[PDB]
Amino acid sequence: KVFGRCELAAAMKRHGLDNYRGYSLGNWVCAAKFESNFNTQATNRNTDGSTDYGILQINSRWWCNDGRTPGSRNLCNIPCSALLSSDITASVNCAKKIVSDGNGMNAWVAWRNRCKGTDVQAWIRGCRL
Ligand SMILES: [Cl-]
Ligand SMILES: [Cl-]
Numbered sequence: 001k002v003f004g005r006c007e008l009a010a011a012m013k014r015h016g017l018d019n020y021r022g023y024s025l026g027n028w029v030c031a032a033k034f035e036s037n038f039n040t041q042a043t044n045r046n047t048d049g050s051t052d053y054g055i056l057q058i059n060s061r062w063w064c065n066d067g068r069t070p071g072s073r074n075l076c077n078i079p080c081s082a083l084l085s086s087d088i089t090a091s092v093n094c095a096k097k098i099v100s101d102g103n104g105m106n107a108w109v110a111w112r113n114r115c116k117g118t119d120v121q122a123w124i125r126g127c128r129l
């Protein structure tokens with residue numbers, strides 16, 4: 001499923017991401033935009049053979065199991081395919097674990113390079129939340 005901007009914002013808010021660990025909702029929407037273009041089915045292969053999955057491009061080296069990233073951890077204890085569902089619950093619950101691990105949203109390269117230090121509230125402007 002390809003989310004609309006306000007649709008996703010509303011779904012992330014209902015799943016508790018607004019101000020989770022201090023990150024306002026605009027940060028999460030901005031990250032999703034640049035990681036996956038709001039597409040829950042996005043996948044991208046990394047140089048090290050791991051793969052990024054879903055709307056927040058969660059990495060199989062650490063966070064989910066795709067059966068083909070040897071020596072990888074499965075810290076969200078889910079199959080990576082669960083992160084491609086139109087229901088964002090699994091991606092959101094896993095993202096909560098990622099952002100709490102110490103580095104905050106710097107774990108998402110696109111957030112660091114394209115959202116951090118920008119007017120991220122613009123991403124939820126005009127949405128009925
Ligand atoms: Cl915001
Ligand atoms: Cl980037």
Ligand code: NA
Pocket residue numbers: 011086087088089
């Ligand atoms: Na959903």
